[PDB]
């Protein structure tokens, strides 16, 4: 009988590429 056991104890670290400089608000504008 398969019992409900705790999930694997993942060794977690934060892997993230932060969105910066609010460049999405300037799409299409020139370098100014």
């Amino acid at each position: 009988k398969v019992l409900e056991l705790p999930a694997y104890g993942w060794a977690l670290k934060n892997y993230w590429l932060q969105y910066v400089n609010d460049w999405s608000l300037r799409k299409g504008d020139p370098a100014v």
């Binding site: 398969v2 705790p6 993942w10 060794a11 977690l12 670290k13 892997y15 608000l25």
Partner: protein, 905 residues
């Protein structure tokens, strides 16, 4: 020395239910074949009718769509004739293959039929086995549709349809009682003389039933006038015959010849081997004629000859005596008033359980078999697991909040009145704050590669692996879990990571880490599943659309195990801004489902993965089963005024489609998990479709429901997960079944929406506080789940409680057991030890069978990595003491080391 008589009936018998039963059949292969090819045959002849009849013929893909119109009385004579003929042949076939009934023989049985039954009788009498009967039976279907079509043509030419018919087909025949046939015939002649009726429009005696009973037919307008002259004590019972039959003044040999012209000429036509009791002819008993000649005579019984039903009883008895038989055993098939046959025929006369199938054969075909949900793991707002997700629902939590800085800066991206470009009016959402967490070592990713991978792909790997272990799936352990039998389906509408985050410095892993096809691909690659791998994009219905594709694969047999999931990770501010520019989003808060002041839906994040299997395979592997999927369907809202807005017409047709496919009714469903995106138009539209399907109201105004119906939307708690909404909704149900509760609904902030129908009158409810949802004793809870998209598509499924587990099992005589723990990292090893100890402290003294099952699970139903730990004992307490002792050594500084690579010698 008994002789069975096989008697088929006419249109007077309501075959609606019998048709419904045959469509439910799935254990008899020759029946399902007959039921797939009969509509093809039916549809083929319907295309050869006149334009007038084609316009009054409905469109249908299967016979199921004809049943309701048959019951309503709006089905023309051509189809209702073929349908009765199909039901008779279908019932006979099932009785003689699935029912394992021996086929009739000329020595010990005869066949008889009245009107339409005369057609089927020819087919049965012309075959010696069920296999031979089908090809003739299909020819008989074509003859039946041509028979009703020809009588229909004469009727329309004779009399026009009346004005208040409303599509219903009027009655051409009526039963008369209290007068002898030859006396009623005289009154007919008299009535004819006084009205100066034309010879064709005259009423006529269509059948002689008994000494005082008979049946008279005529055009409806004329029949009504004549019946008005038959005063009490005479009786008048109107029959459901919608065309003239048994009329020598209307039909001729050319009409018969035309009906049977669909029978190609040949020399191999079988003859009538079994005597047919043709009691309405000169020769009561007939045999030997070829199938076409025998069929023409049968058609003649319908159009030319009157029914001598008063001779049916004695005609059968005389044949029985002719073969020295003492009595007869009636075997009626869709015969009106059939019970009276037995005594009536015998009055003229003096007067083991099925064997178990070989293992593997008892199971029904893979097509339309319950698909079992084995396990589900996911990430939801403020929830790192399914268990924490239930905390959100049962405590009525609203998880919506302003966009966090980890995604984008609301100060620059959000404005009360947005005028600058790419600025939105809302910044709300239900977010996964731990969406970046991942175990790159476990999945063989470098620290430089993991950041480039869409968190959707990462969380898909975590949830998928958790669900697999939760389901006790070990590749290649069993037949159903062979690597080449496992497929993966995911729903994903967006790829924000690849548009906003990694695009800031395109590197080497940009495509594989951002492309959606790699969402299931990485799962296939990591666990080495060589089955199919798909991503579905139907916008806000993607995940349930993928669940549909996965179920089809299982039903078709392309896979034995299916991994189904959905992902929604929001990192691109343009998507929210665009959604707000289109007015999809609520600028005040979360989805306010059913609230009078609902102003849109609130974007939500979620990742869920489930494991599916055809129920028999799930039980063969002793897998866990949380619920079973009975059906699932998809259509499109083509009839909407705008492309975006969904429309209720298409949604209801879907709800009823799945109820019919599953063989259920409104009362069988007790809960509906609606789409419910918190829109005044959407919530009122969907609510009307659900109640009209699951809580219809009587014509008097009362409730058709005997038990209450509860409706709710998960989006009021965790928002609209878009491509992951369907599975999020499904996850909620799995928890509701587990905990046997209906969680409160938090979407109603102020007042209930006024567009909704009177729910209380229909016995429908929106639970304001939690409600017990107990499983009935020896019963199941069944659910309807909806999930729609702004692109127009609609998807919904029917869910069901899991089966009752095996009662027996067995006692494990082994005194000592072994428990195995494994991990890929020293830190993960410490974690699993800790987590296993806390688990044993929760389930320490529940039962003695826990330890053998714990061993079985951790060993046979688990993969074993390089770092390993073991404990052995006779009870759970010993296992803990051992694992605790091992844990202490790990905490004291002795690190976990992987076992040598080659293994032991």
């Amino acid at each position: 020395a008994q002789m069975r008589v096989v008697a088929f009936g006419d249109q007077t018998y309501d075959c609606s239910e019998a048709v419904s039963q045959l469509l439910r059949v799935r254990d008899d292969a020759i029946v399902v074949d007959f039921l797939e090819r009969a509509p093809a045959v039916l549809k083929a002849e319907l295309a050869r009718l006149s334009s007038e009849q084609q316009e009054e013929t409905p469109r249908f893909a299967t016979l199921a769509e004809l049943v309701p119109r048959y019951r309503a009385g709006t089905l023309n004579p051509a189809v209702s004739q073929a349908l009765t003929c199909i039901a008779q042949l279908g019932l006979f076939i099932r009785q003689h293959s699935s029912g394992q009934e021996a086929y009739p023989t000329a020595h010990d049985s005869c066949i008889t039929g009245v009107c339409t039954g005369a057609l089927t009788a020819v087919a049965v009498g012309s075959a010696s086995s069920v296999t031979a009967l089908v090809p003739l039976a299909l020819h008989t279907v074509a003859v039946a549709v041509r028979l009703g079509a020809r009588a229909w043509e004469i009727g329309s030419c004779l009399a026009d349809a009346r004005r208040g018919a409303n599509g219903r087909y009027a009655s051409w025949t009526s039963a008369v009682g209290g007068i002898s046939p030859q006396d009623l015939q005289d009154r007919i002649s008299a009535y004819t003389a006084e009205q100066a009726l034309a010879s064709v429009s005259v009423p006529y005696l269509s059948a002689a039933v008994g000494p005082g009973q008979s049946s008279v037919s005529a055009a409806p307008v004329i029949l009504d006038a004549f019946l008005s002259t038959l005063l009490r004590p005479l009786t008048t019972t109107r029959l459901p015959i919608t065309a003239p039959y048994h009329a020598p003044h209307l039909f001729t040999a050319k009409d018969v010849q035309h009906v049977t012209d669909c029978l190609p000429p040949s020399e191999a036509w079988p003859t009538v081997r079994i005597p047919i009791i043709s009691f309405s002819r000169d020769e009561a008993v007939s045999r030997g004629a070829s199938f076409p000649a025998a069929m023409s005579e049968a058609v003649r019984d319908c159009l030319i000859r009157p029914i001598a039903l008063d001779r049916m009883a004695v005609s059968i008895a005389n044949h029985a005596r002719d073969l020295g038989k003492d009595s007869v055993l009636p075997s009626p098939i869709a015969l009106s008033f059939s019970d009276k046959l037995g005594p009536q025929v015998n009055s003229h006369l003096p007067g083991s359980k099925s064997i178990p199938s070989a293992i593997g054969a008892e199971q029904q075909p893979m097509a339309k078999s319950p698909i079992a949900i084995l396990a589900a793991s996911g990430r939801f707002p403020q929830s790192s697991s399914m268990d924490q997700f239930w905390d959100v629902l049962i405590n009525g939590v609203d998880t919506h909040e302003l966009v966090p800085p980890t995604r984008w800066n609301a100060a620059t991206h959000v404005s009360e009145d947005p005028k600058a470009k790419n600025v939105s009016g809302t910044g709300f959402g239900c977010w996964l704050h731990e969406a970046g967490e991942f175990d790159a070592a476990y999945f063989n990713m470098s620290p430089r590669e993991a950041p480039q991978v869409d968190p959707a792909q990462r969380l898909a790997l975590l949830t998928a692996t958790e669900a697999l272990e939760q389901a006790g799936v070990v590749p290649n352990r069993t037949s159903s879990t062979q690597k080449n039998r496992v497929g993966v389906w995911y729903g994903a509408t967006s790829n924000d990571w690849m548009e906003t985050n990694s695009a800031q410095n395109v590197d080497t892993y940009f495509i594989p880490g951002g492309n959606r096809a790699f969402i299931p691909g990485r799962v296939n690659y990591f666990h080495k599943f060589s089955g199919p791998s798909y991503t579905i994009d139907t916008a806000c219905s993607s995940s349930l659309a993928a669940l549909h594709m996965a179920c089809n694969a299982l039903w078709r047999g392309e896979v034995d195990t299916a991994i189904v999931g959905g992902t929604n990770v929001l990192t691109n501010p343009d998507m929210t801004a665009g959604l707000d520019a289109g007015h999809f989003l609520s600028r005040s808060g979360n989805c306010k489902t059913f609230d009078d002041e609902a102003d849109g839906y609130c974007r939500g994040e979620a990742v869920v993965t489930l494991i599916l299997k055809r129920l028999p395979d799930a039980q063969a592997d002793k897998d866990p089963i949380q619920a079973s999927i009975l059906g699932i369907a998809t259509n499109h809202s083509a009839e909407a005024a705008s492309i975006t807005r969904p429309h209720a017409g298409a949604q209801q047709d879907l709800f009823q489609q799945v109820l019919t496919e599953t063989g259920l009714t409104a009362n069988d469903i007790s809960v509906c998990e609606m789409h419910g995106t918190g829109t005044q138009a959407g919530d009122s539209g969907e609510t009307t479709s659900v109640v009209e399907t699951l809580a219809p109201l009587n014509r008097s105004g009362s409730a058709v429901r005997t038990t209450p119906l509860y409706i709710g939307a998960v989006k009021s708690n965790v928002g609209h997960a878009e491509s992951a909404a369907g599975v999020s909704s499904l996850a909620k149900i799995l928890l509701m079944l587990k905990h046997s509760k209906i969680p409160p609904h938090v979407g109603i902030k102020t007042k209930l929406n006024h567009r909704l129908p009177d729910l209380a009158a229909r016995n429908t409810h929106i639970a304001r506080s939690e409600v017990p949802w107990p499983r009935p004793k020896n019963g199941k809870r069944r659910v309807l789940l909806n999930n729609f998209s702004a692109a127009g598509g609609n998807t919904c499924l029917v869910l069901e409680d899991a089966p009752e587990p095996e009662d027996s099992q067995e006692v494990d005589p082994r005194e000592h057991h072994i428990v195995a723990l494994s991990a890929k990292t020293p830190d993960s090893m410490v974690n699993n030890l800790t987590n296993m100890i806390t688990w044993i402290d929760k389930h320490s003294g529940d039962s003695l069978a826990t330890l053998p099952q714990l061993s079985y699970t951790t060993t046979a139903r688990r993969v074993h990595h390089r770092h390993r730990a073991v404990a052995t004992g006779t009870d759970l307490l010993q296992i803990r003491s051992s694992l605790q002792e091992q844990l202490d050594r790990r905490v004291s500084g002795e690190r976990s080391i992987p076992h040598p690579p080659n293994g032991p010698s």
